[PDB]
Amino acid sequence: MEIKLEEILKKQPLYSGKAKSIYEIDDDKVLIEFRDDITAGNGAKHDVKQGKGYLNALISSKLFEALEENGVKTHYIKYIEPRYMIAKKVEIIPIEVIVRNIAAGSLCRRYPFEEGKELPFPIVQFDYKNDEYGDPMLNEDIAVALGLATREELNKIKEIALKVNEVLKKLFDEKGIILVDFKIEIGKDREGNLLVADEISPDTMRLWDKETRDVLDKDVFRKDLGDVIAKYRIVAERLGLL
Amino acid sequence: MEIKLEEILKKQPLYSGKAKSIYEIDDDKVLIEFRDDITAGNGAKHDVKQGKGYLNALISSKLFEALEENGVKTHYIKYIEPRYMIAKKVEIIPIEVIVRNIAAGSLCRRYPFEEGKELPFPIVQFDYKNDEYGDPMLNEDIAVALGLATREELNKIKEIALKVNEVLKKLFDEKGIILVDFKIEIGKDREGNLLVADEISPDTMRLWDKETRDVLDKDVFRKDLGDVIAKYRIVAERLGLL
Ligand SMILES: Nc1ncnc2c1ncn2[C@@H]1O[C@H](COP(=O)(O)OP(=O)(O)OP(=O)(O)O)[C@@H](O)[C@H]1O
Numbered sequence: 001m002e003i004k005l006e007e008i009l010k011k012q013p014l015y016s017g018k019a020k021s022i023y024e025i026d027d028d029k030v031l032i033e034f035r036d037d038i039t040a041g042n043g044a045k046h047d048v049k050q051g052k053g054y055l056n057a058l059i060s061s062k063l064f065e066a067l068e069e070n071g072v073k074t075h076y077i078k079y080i081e082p083r084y085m086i087a088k089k090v091e092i093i094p095i096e097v098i099v100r101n102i103a104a105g106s107l108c109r110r111y112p113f114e115e116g117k118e119l120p121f122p123i124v125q126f127d128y129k130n131d132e133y134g135d136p137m138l139n140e141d142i143a144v145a146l147g148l149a150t151r152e153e154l155n156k157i158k159e160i161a162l163k164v165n166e167v168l169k170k171l172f173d174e175k176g177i178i179l180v181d182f183k184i185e186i187g188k189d190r191e192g193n194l195l196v197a198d199e200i201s202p203d204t205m206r207l208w209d210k211e212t213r214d215v216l217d218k219d220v221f222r223k224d225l226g227d228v229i230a231k232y233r234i235v236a237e238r239l240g241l242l
Numbered sequence: 243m244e245i246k247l248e249e250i251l252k253k254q255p256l257y258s259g260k261a262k263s264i265y266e267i268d269d270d271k272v273l274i275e276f277r278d279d280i281t282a283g284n285g286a287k288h289d290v291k292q293g294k295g296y297l298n299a300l301i302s303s304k305l306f307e308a309l310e311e312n313g314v315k316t317h318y319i320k321y322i323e324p325r326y327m328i329a330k331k332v333e334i335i336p337i338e339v340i341v342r343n344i345a346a347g348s349l350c351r352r353y354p355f356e357e358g359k360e361l362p363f364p365i366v367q368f369d370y371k372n373d374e375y376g377d378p379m380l381n382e383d384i385a386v387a388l389g390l391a392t393r394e395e396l397n398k399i400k401e402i403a404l405k406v407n408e409v410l411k412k413l414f415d416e417k418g419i420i421l422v423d424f425k426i427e428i429g430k431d432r433e434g435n436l437l438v439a440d441e442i443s444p445d446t447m448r449l450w451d452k453e454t455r456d457v458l459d460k461d462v463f464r465k466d467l468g469d470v471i472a473k474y475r476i477v478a479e480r481l482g483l484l
């Protein structure tokens with residue numbers, strides 16, 4: 001007994017996106033509901049798949065706990081089955097932070113990188129979160145001129161990104177999974193601390209089986225590669241969450 | 243009695259681009275011919291305007307001489323009227339270096355910047371020079387991972403771009419002209435020195451009259467604003483080259 005889940009869900013979400021609903025708990029905490037909605041191509045492709053929110057909330061809680069254990073400060077407070085998460089309320093910085101270990105996705109489409117090729121070092125990419133503009137890639141000068149964050153913050157965010165990568169890449173490799181790349185969102189809590197927020201799940205990470213390189217993330221849905229839920233379940237399974 | 247110009251021109255160009263032809267003089271020097279061809283939208287729009295090569299070579303020679311006088315090392319050796327330039331031969335780094343003082347062009351199209359609005363500081367943008375990929379914008383990590391240049395070179399290139407900007411912006415302001423932005427190319431000479439190469443002309447700079455903000459650069463041609471050659475000539479006039 002700590003939060004009145006059933007009563008909070010009866011309220012109107014402070015915000016409702018394409019995959020999750022944010023409900024208010026109090027002044028500094030929110031209830032995050034992982035829905036069964038799954039999207040691709042920026043909304044262009046959508047469906048509702050049973051067990052998606054359950055698996056993503058489950059995996060995300062585990063990765064956050066792993067990060068916290070390694071000193072990475074996050075918005076995670078606790079997991080409430082099957083698809084809810086209690087988190088510290090933050091003000092999200094409109095920047096998609098992408099870290100890449102293997103060339104894939106837009107990197108290969110936009111530059112002469114061979115898909116599946118190991119990168120010399122983890123590439124960090126900042127994208128402007130703005131639908132009207134198609135989420136264009138940013139460089140440090142532009143983000144600062146746009147007033148999205150200060151130079152020092154942008155660099156701190158990059159360091160957090162690389163630390164997150166270090167923790168996760170190792171964790172998944174031990175579980176026979178290759179962390180191809182991932183995207184995180186950072187936000188400032190009531191005290192102004194920079195916290196990894198949002199989620200960290202197969203919806204936000206590219207994960208390939210180490211042996212076969214079978215796709216285990218949302219790309220399965222984007223490119224209709226097979227049973228996405230069954231693959232998401234393999235991830236949870238590998239992490240020992242089932 | 244300089245180089246054997248008339249004889250050099252009879253030779254097949256080492257390279258011919260959309261606006262200039264590169265002829266070999268010797269092992270470490272080249273003759274650069276500014277043609278009258280003018281293009282926009284990546285070759286999609288083209289024309290031949292008498293006097294363009296003459297005006298751009300004339301202006302570029304003057305700007306290079308100004309940069310050299312301020313310590314910026316360039317490939318410029320001497321100007322041969324009406325449209326030729328003797329330059330140190332260099333290996334061009336496939337990166338388009340853009341510096342912006344005022345928001346315009348792609349900056350306003352890709353991000354929520356107000357056109358004509360003064361930027362808080364000179365924004366430096368690196369674009370990958372590659373037709374097959376549409377010259378995508380780069381960030382430091384991508385450029386290095388692609389092997390275009392070392393991190394140290396990239397930062398050295400940025401320092402150069404900003405010094406160039408400092409010199410040119412002041413020069414044009416004294417001549418009643420606002421240097422909105424510009425794009426330069428860097429190359430390595432026989433000794434490995436990083437030199438500002440190619441050209442610096444109304445074809446590569448956005449220049450607006452200080453009082454009226456009338457466009458004086460190639461945008462006049464891109465958007466059919468009027469007599470492009472007459473405007474280019476105004477730039478030459480202001481610089482006292484006519
Ligand atoms: N701790 C938090 N406090 C406040 N808002 C949060 C927190 N964590 C994540 N959010 C926001 O929850 C919203 C809904 O998630 P989703 O529904 O995942 O968003 P989108 O994916 O619809 O928006 P993004 O594409 O996330 O802007 C996102 O806009 C995200 O920034």
Ligand SMILES: Nc1ncnc2c1ncn2[C@@H]1O[C@H](COP(=O)(O)OP(=O)(O)OP(=O)(O)O)[C@@H](O)[C@H]1O
Nearest residue numbers: 258259260261262264317329330331332334439440
């Ligand atoms: N000092 C130099 N030595 C060797 N090559 C040079 C030198 N200066 C510029 N160049 C090259 O000469 C070409 C100029 O022709 P342009 O007609 O200017 O080419 P593009 O139109 O092919 O230019 P991009 O190639 O668009 O810069 C460019 O490809 C440029 O990189």
